[PDB]
């Protein structure tokens, strides 16, 4: 109905809740998101100042038979900040509180907070850290319910795994604290938007063991495709050996030629060269152009380098954005990559890429480390024993080309086939969800054998399906 907006806006007006609809003059300014390939088209946007107003917005959505959709800082690569067109979007910006409990060492952050100010408050107040995504403007809540693997996650774990309590407002306005060990908390670790509006969240915190830490580059230049594949398999072997500490981090670009990457080291700075020596020795046997450059930085200066100048600003900086389409696969330590699989990946993606209307953007992050003690059943998003996080992407120079998606999906299909051929099952990463997958595909790749349990929790907490608000929302059984 094309007067649905009118009934909703009058419902919200009567509840004292600031809101806009597409006849408001600020509609354009309030419908902005990071992903430019998709166009936001909510039915209305509410701006609750407190939990009572969130409850009143939920009732309004139910009364007009529309879905409810939380809007954080708008970073979703899938457009989920606004969701499927026709939602009542609930803008969470007022929920910006952050507080630290120095007795428990738990940090509490509101449902609309950004990474930068949460980290800076914790660092300035207590000299402590919480693993986080590589963008100070990103929503802490949104990024944490979708995984959030960051540079410190090989030794400190992921943002999602370090949560301990989530304060939910459910579809009927009831507030509940979901604690670690419960079904609602388990479901929120991978599918949090499907169960309610998150008002605040508590997380573990950590003390860095050294004042300074290291950012490095590793470069091997222009290699043959076979030599590039050997190099990746050698990096993998090092990462699985006794020579690689969990305080290491490394991102291997999928941009070749050239072959190179960027990494970090969070152990004792003077140990760096001995940590890297076994890796460099092996890579030198593949190419003499192997070269490592490194810098020692104070803890916070390195954090600003990783996640941007917004780390120092009260809203975490600027949104930015471009037009792109993300694909992403994860693999585990039960299926280390072969030289053939590494070559097929690069041959089909970055080495074949020949568009002049898009610019390729690919990389694979070394996971591993403390993922070794995680089981796929421990959290809704199955990531036990993850070893690689692979992202293959491309951003449009202008508008996104009509054949871009089919071109990009065909690029990496041979690699997917090769993973299956060697006996792996295809897996994904929620924050890098692939908008083009069927339900059978994304449910298998994100939730594998947790999916049936996830749907039973969904019926318990959202029987009306009010929060079935994006393409990969958990359905009712
Ligand atoms: C823009 C961006 C994203 C990003 C990144 C760097 C930048 C510049 N770096 C990342 C990284 O290093 N690692 C990673 O895993 N992801 C990274 N991202 C992606 C980002 O984490 C995800 O896109 C994330 O979903 C963004 O969340 P944010 O909250 O900022 O964005 P949103 O579009 O408005 O909302 C995303 C989804 O989460 C739900 N949500 C958000 N807040 C709530 C609350 N309070 N309650 C319930 N659900 C909530 C939204 O409904 C939507 O589904
Ligand atoms: C590690 O990160 C630092 C901080 O960003 C990099 O230092 C910058 O280096 C460029 C030139 O390479 C200068 O123009 C910047 O002014 C530097 N910034 C600071 C704060 O010093 C450093 O190059 C990185 N080290 C690597 C990649 O090995
Ligand atoms: C670009 O790549 C596509 C995909 O294989 C191919 O069909 C096309 O001929 C290529 N164009 C050029 C100029 O190489
Ligand atoms: C609100 O919904 C939850 C979700 O099932 C339910 O447990 C609770 O009883 C409901 N509360 C009220 C007051 O209806
Ligand atoms: Cl030091």
Numbering used by the authors: 23 to 499
Quoted from the paper:
Here, we report phylogenetic analyses, combined with the selection and characterisation of five fungal AA7s, three of which belong to previously unexplored clades. We determined the crystal structures of FgChi7B and FgCelDH7C at resolutions of 2.4 and 1.6 Å, respectively. Moreover, the two enzymes share an aromatic cluster comprising: (i) the catalytic base tyrosine (FgCelDH7C Y454), (ii) a tyrosine/phenylalanine (FgCelDH7C F99) that stacks onto and stabilises the catalytic base, and (iii) an aromatic residue that stacks mainly onto the saccharide unit penultimate to the reducing end (FgCelDH7C F383).
By contrast, FgCelDH7C acted as a dehydrogenase with a preference for cellooligosaccharides with kcat values of 32–42 s−1 and the highest catalytic efficiency on cellotriose. The first notable overall structural difference is that a loop (residues Q335-F346) that flanks the active site in FgCelDH7C appears shorter due to a preceding helical segment that folds away from the active site, which provides a less occluded and more solvent-exposed FAD-cofactor compared to FgChi7B and all hitherto reported AA7 structures. Strikingly, the mode of FAD-anchoring represents a second unique characteristic distinguishing FgCelDH7C from the other AA7 structures. By contrast, FgCelDH7C is mono-covalently histidyl-tethered due to the substitution of the FAD-tethering cysteine to a glycine. A fourth different motif in FgCelDH7C entails four arginine residues that protrude into the substrate-binding pocket, providing a distinctively positive charged milieu compared to other structurally characterised AA7s. On the other hand, the uniquely open and positively charged active site of FgCelDH7C, compared to structural homologues, may favour the accommodation of organic electron acceptors to promote the dehydrogenase oxidative half reaction.
